[PDB]
């Protein structure tokens, strides 16, 4: 009976490929042709944040575009005032090996996790004047890669055991589990309406998930190695990926196939992080060659370089109002660009 | 100064935070970090018990020196993704069980793992300590069963010394970075404290080399 099932699976895959080929009629490049280039982009460092004494792995902006949080190899979590480089809070961590951090939309909580397989919740606004931990989530059997708040009572996490989960903070229990991947899941991104999200894994595939239903809708392939970063488009109808084969690609939800590829012959190392601008016109990625490159989303040309770090670039993000950009590196410094 | 009282108080609070951060970093810089690697049933647990989630951390002090050791055996995930996190350790402790030779066989798996770890890009100048355990059981079983099963080319006499020397020589035959790193080989003793002394003596030379680099003479 196995042979019949395998033949049916192959027939279904051929049908899917034929349908995708039939849908494609024009290339993205031809549509966005005869368009004036954006020009050269030059930015300079406006702030430098000092105080970490080891490699930095993650950061996240606040919702008011003034406060931010970052995590480092030493067990420290720091909240920065960005207008004046003041340290609002400093949080010691029980476990030194962290990989991700998040800041709540309301502003009352932060979260982090790593090789301990646990996600921790910290309360910022208390009548005693100090920050303490409130909840710990302990379901996964692999290391945590990413996490994002939905509200003051919901959060979604990603793990290296090829699964994702949704939690209820008040009771500390899992509500839904997403099991479709084959390799380790590296990153996730939330939709603007918080009804959907996407993930990327080491099996060189990406999937789309429904939060309420808890079932998988679409699957995307094409990369030749592990996918390291993923990000939504501002209107929520596209997303971008970055992989170890030294390239980027763009996907469409309604078309359900690739549109554009961003690559260069001289570039050989992989990509660590990626993010979009406010308008969705610029694509920003960090690389292993100590540089951060600026890509046009509509075109396939390089638009700028942010060369100010002495080691690998780990993370990067953009404010809600679109004013400034932050980068972290393995040299233990944070920079604000504008 | 173009600042109000609130801003001045905020600046003072920030300075008090930087002071504590610097003090904590200076305190933490002095400790010694070790990474523990090995295959299944290789005697790692015995070594851990003798020397005083997904990651387990052990700490102890010996002769005015502070040690912290980490084992990641229960991760069971892709090692390439998180192996670079432990860059910067003083030395790596790698364990191999001699008795696991008749039972493909575990010895080839251990050799493959050792070759993979030794030639890694992250560990180019990191000294590696190689342990051999289960000596008594190996000696007992050697009389009953020859060692030629694992190594058909081996023609030495059926004695403990020659077999152990041949196995050790095969282990350091896999090194290809003899210039930067040194491999240390030891035989585990059950009711003894020679293992801790061996590790301490090994790490003292690494500390000396680091000081020589820092002073600028090297």
């Amino acid at each position: 009976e196995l042979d019949q099932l395998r033949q049916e699976a192959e027939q279904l895959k051929n049908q899917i490929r034929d349908a995708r080929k039939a849908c494609a009629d024009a290339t993205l490049s031809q549509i966005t042709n005869n368009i004036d280039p954006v020009g050269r982009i030059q930015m300079r460092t406006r702030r430098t944040l000092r105080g970490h004494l080891a490699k930095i792995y993650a950061m996240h902006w606040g919702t008011d575009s003034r406060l931010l949080v970052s995590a480092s190899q030493d067990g420290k979590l720091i909240i920065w005032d960005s207008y004046t480089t003041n340290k609002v809070h400093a949080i010691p961590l029980r476990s030194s090996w962290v990989m991700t951090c998040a800041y709540a939309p309301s502003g009352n909580y932060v979260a982090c996790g790593g090789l301990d397989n646990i996600c921790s919740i910290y309360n910022l606004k208390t009548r005693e004047g100090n920050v303490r931990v409130s909840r710990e989530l302990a379901g996964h059997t692999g290391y945590l890669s990413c996490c994002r708040f939905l509200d003051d009572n919901q959060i979604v996490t990603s793990s290296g055991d090829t699964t994702c989960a949704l939690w209820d903070i008040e009771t500390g229990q899992q509500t839904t589990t997403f099991t479709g991947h084959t390799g380790d899941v590296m990153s996730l991104s939330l939709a603007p309406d918080t009804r959907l999200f996407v993930s990327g894994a080491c099996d060189a595939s990406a999937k789309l998930w429904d939060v309420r239903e808890g079932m998988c809708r679409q699957t995307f392939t094409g990369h030749e190695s592990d996918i390291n970063a993923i990000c939504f488009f501002p209107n929520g109808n596209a997303f971008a990926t970055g992989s170890d084969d030294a390239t980027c690609r763009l996907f469409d939800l309604r078309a359900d196939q690739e549109l554009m590829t961003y690559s260069h012959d001289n570039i050989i190392c992989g990509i660590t992080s990626v993010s979009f601008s406010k308008s969705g016109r610029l694509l920003l990625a960090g690389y292993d060659d100590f540089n951060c490159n600026v890509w046009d989303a509509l075109k396939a040309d390089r638009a700028g370089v942010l060369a100010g770090h002495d080691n690998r670039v780990s993370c990067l993000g953009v404010t809600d109002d679109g004013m400034a950009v932050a980068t972290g590196s393995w040299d233990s410094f944070l920079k604000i660009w504008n | 100064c173009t600042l109000s009282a609130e801003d001045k108080a905020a600046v003072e609070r920030s300075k008090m935070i930087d002071r504590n951060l610097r003090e904590d970093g200076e305190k933490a810089a002095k400790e010694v970090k070790l990474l523990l690697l090995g295959a299944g049933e290789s005697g790692k647990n015995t070594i851990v018990k003798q020397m005083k989630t997904g990651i387990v951390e052990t700490h102890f002090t010996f002769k005015d020196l502070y040690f912290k050791m980490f084992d990641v055996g229960a991760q069971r995930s892709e090692r390439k993704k998180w192996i670079h996190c432990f860059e910067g350790v003083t030395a790596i402790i790698f364990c191999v069980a001699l008795s696991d030779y008749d039972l493909m066989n575990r010895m080839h798996a251990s050799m493959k793992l050792f070759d993979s770890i030794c030639n890694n890009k992250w560990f180019t100048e990191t000294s590696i300590i190689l342990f051999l355990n289960k000596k008594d059981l190996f000696e007992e079983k050697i009389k009953r069963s020859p060692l030629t099963i694992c190594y058909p080319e081996y023609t030495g006499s059926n004695t403990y010394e020659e077999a152990a020397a041949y196995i050790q020589c095969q282990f350091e035959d896999l090194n290809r970075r003899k210039d930067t790193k040194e491999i240390y080989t030891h035989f585990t003793c059950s009711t003894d404290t020679k293992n801790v002394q061996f590790v301490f003596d090994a790490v003292t030379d690494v500390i000396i080399k680091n000081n020589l680099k820092e002073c600028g003479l090297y």
Epitope: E128 | S4, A5, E6, A9, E12
Partner: single-chain antibody, 228 residues
């Protein structure tokens, strides 16, 4: 959160006495502390201030040279040493914390009584205003200098002292505090300010005070009494 002050009593002129305060229920080492004074029939007056970590100390001109303020963070205790008494009034303890988005002057003390045998002016031009439940109330306080700073903050504060009780913060930086109803609202200009109550209640009977925190010293406005 508790703040209890002790001392007081009857003291002859030309004497010395020390007051103490004990903190509880919060991280005392992370807060600054103040002393504020109220005369038997007059308004509130500020006395002294000590910073967190003992970096900064301030005094008032009327009392400078004769008073001493010190803290003991291990024991969570506050002190005030007074010498050469001439000072019959009520003394209170106030905690305050300063960082981005913080809420200073949030908690006050019960108070103790002692009986002896170039500045910005706050003036309130209304007093003994009649009021009935269900009716809106508007109250204004005046200043001699602009409270608006270059960064963009207006440093005006509102307090309520119900009969027989210590003052309570209602509005800060001219932003509603935690634990008070949304009836109260705050708005104003560079030099003119007003406090509005949407619907009067029985618990709203008391005296209002306006205060400024732009620069030292700290000055209290006069009283504004609401009857029924």
């Amino acid at each position: 959160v508790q703040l209890v002050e002790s001392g007081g009593g009857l003291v002859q002129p030309g004497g010395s006495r020390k007051l103490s305060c004990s903190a509880s229920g919060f991280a005392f080492s992370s807060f600054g502390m103040h002393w504020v004074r109220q005369a038997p029939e007059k308004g509130l007056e500020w006395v002294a201030y000590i910073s967190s970590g003992s970096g900064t100390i301030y005094y008032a001109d009327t009392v400078k040279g004769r008073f001493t303020i010190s803290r003991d963070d291990p024991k969570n205790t506050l002190f005030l040493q007074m010498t050469s008494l001439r000072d019959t009034a009520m003394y209170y303890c106030v905690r305050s914390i300063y960082y981005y988005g913080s809420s200073p002057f949030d908690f006050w003390g019960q108070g103790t009584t002692l009986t002896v045998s170039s500045d910005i002016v706050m003036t309130q031009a209304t007093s003994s205003v009649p009021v009935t439940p269900g009716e809106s109330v508007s109250i204004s306080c005046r200043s001699s200098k602009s409270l608006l700073h270059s960064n963009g903050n207006t440093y005006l504060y509102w307090f309520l002292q119900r009969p027989g009780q210590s003052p309570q913060l209602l509005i800060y930086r001219m932003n509603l505090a935690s634990g008070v109803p949304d009836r109260f609202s705050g708005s104003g200009s560079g030099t003119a300010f007003t406090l509005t109550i949407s619907r009067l209640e029985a618990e709203d009977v008391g005296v209002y005070y306006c205060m400024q925190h732009l620069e030292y010293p700290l000055t209290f406005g006069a009283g504004t009494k609401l009857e029924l």
